[PDB]
Structure 1
């Protein structure tokens, strides 16, 4: 049982929580990490900074930790500026195709893929005031990255393997302040999940679903006090008033990835203490 988690920059995200729970079930974990934060993540790991967090009387497995940039499909896609940037030029094989081939050489076929990354340069702006170039950015890094991720991993994956991504309810209902086309990319990503589920199903016997998670105070969540407010609101209005942990998403992700969800494919599962069901406060 091998899982590649694409998109973990630290310990405060959904990627980490997913990692943790996949370990409880003894699956081997390969982190794919964005180069802007790669050196410093590695450093912290070495300094045993994440050592508290790797606690489960269990200890986390971490098979490998690779540089990974979901905006590049192949090496030909890497622009020269990036190729030479201070933070990339010492690193290698970080395109989507490249990490796919890496992994396969080092470990062969794997059977679990977590897409856990999103990005938009104009997330701060709202839809109307987002540029074409900013919108297409959001969709390229949040939505298309999934598709591409699939294209390349699908054949280093065994039959009956399963894939998941992460989404947010703002695709289905309006959350003012979730901007830059981020809603649009979650909308796109939830649709692609259905279409990919059809293709990967018939053709590769491979499942794909997506988890619509609640608010977590991740690094990326602070890409705009919205989130503190979102957590506040969720903890007062959701059917379940417990605090939403990333491990909560993690245990569901783990389930989706296991053979136990063998007959669930193409779905948007909500893991959010049921907030999505409410129309009216009280």
Structure 2
């Protein structure tokens, strides 16, 4: 009924960004994707070649309602931030207005004010290297894209939101307890994301009456998951064997939580980490 959500960080339909997009369509929210420049063109190709038709079907006679699809790179806050190499690059040269600020500006100009923000991107150049052999550049690159991205997104997008808006992002338990293969300081990144959620909760709550929470999802065989080193195959088999609920976790599991988290229905919740993981986090010794 004139609800519009922006989802940062889709590349295909095997991630949580898709799951979140499915479920929100059930509540008749219009969807706008933010797609990372280097995969935008291919994503666009697949969409037009119908690769995703099936994944867009919902309930009885309802389709997913994609208002727009835009290039978006969470590396850059303004135009002033893009370096000579990136600008010059084959992926980027063909596109424009993909910075955090340019995307707020562009959405707002095309469609007016929105009321739903989702952060659903992570990126860590050295993810495959354990924390101890992670370099300074790789650590900060991880923090920049995976965590600072959240603050920037909030900082530009509050302007174009209505009061009583909601914002989520996705996190992982590795921030609280040691996950051996989750390297490159994605642990570190997730650590800070959760803490920033509490801090943003305070500022966004008192100064605009906008809520923010994060969802701590169990494992899901996504594009990004397979970039780690298998690891994600072990995480899935372990989860389905030792979690208090022995069923397959689905992107739409997280999706529905996000939708309730994004609705008036959770008015009294903010600054929280909510686990959507079939209860895995509560276990100590595997039985």
The TM tier, using the shorter chain, reads over 0.9
CA drift at 1:209: 0.2
Over residues 89-143 of structure 1, what are the superposed CA-to-partner deviations in whole Å (9 max), with x where a residue is unaligned?
1100000000000000001110000000000000000000000000001000000
Question: Tell me, what secondary structure is at the counterpart of 1:76?
Answer: helix
Over residues 197-239 of structure 1, what are the superposed CA-to-partner deviations in whole Å (9 max), with x where a residue is unaligned?
0000000100000000000001000112001110000000000
Correspondences of 1:31-50 after superposition (within 5 Å): 31-50=33-52
Give the TM-score of the pair, scaled to structure 2: 0.98
Return the alpha-carbon distance in structure 2 between the equivalents of residues 252 and 266 of structure 1: 15
Question: Tell me, what secondary structure is at the counterpart of 1:49?
Answer: coil
* Segment of structure 1 superposing worse, 52-61 or 227-236: 52-61
Question: Tell me, what secondary structure is at the counterpart of 1:160?
Answer: strand
Over residues 134-177 of structure 1, what are the superposed CA-to-partner deviations in whole Å (9 max), with x where a residue is unaligned?
00010000000000000000110000000000000000000001
CA drift at 1:65: 0.1
Return the alpha-carbon distance in structure 2 between the equivalents of residues 155 and 209 of structure 1: 19
* Segment of structure 1 superposing worse, 55-64 or 210-219: 55-64
CA drift at 1:35: 0.8
CA drift at 1:80: 1.1
Over residues 10-33 of structure 1, what are the superposed CA-to-partner deviations in whole Å (9 max), with x where a residue is unaligned?
000000000000001100000000
Alignment equivalent of 2:257, drawn from 252, 275, 278: 252
Question: Tell me, what secondary structure is at the counterpart of 1:63?
Answer: strand
Question: Tell me, what secondary structure is at the counterpart of 2:62?
Answer: coil
Over residues 11-58 of structure 1, what are the superposed CA-to-partner deviations in whole Å (9 max), with x where a residue is unaligned?
000000000000011000000000110000000000011001001132
Match of 1:229 in 2: 234
Match of 2:11 in 1: 9
Question: Tell me, what secondary structure is at the counterpart of 1:7?
Answer: strand
Return the alpha-carbon distance in structure 2 between the equivalents of residues 55 and 245 of structure 1: 16
Return the alpha-carbon distance in structure 1 between the equivalents of residues 4 and 70 of structure 2: 14
Question: Tell me, what secondary structure is at the counterpart of 2:34?
Answer: strand
Structure 1 residue ranges without an equivalent (≥5):
none
Return the alpha-carbon distance in structure 1 between the equivalents of residues 226 and 62 of structure 2: 31
Structure 2 residue ranges without an equivalent (≥5):
none
Match of 1:118 in 2: 122
Match of 1:135 in 2: 139
Return the alpha-carbon distance in structure 2 between the equivalents of residues 218 and 139 of structure 1: 21
Match of 1:281 in 2: 286
Aligned CA RMSD, in angstroms, stands at 0.5
Match of 1:18 in 2: 20
Return the alpha-carbon distance in structure 1 between the equivalents of residues 144 and 115 of structure 2: 25
Return the alpha-carbon distance in structure 2 between the equivalents of residues 91 and 51 of structure 1: 25
The list of structure 1 runs, each at least 4 consecutive aligned residues, that deviate by more than 2 angstroms after superposition, is none
Question: Tell me, what secondary structure is at the counterpart of 2:63?
Answer: coil
Return the alpha-carbon distance in structure 2 between the equivalents of residues 120 and 142 of structure 1: 8
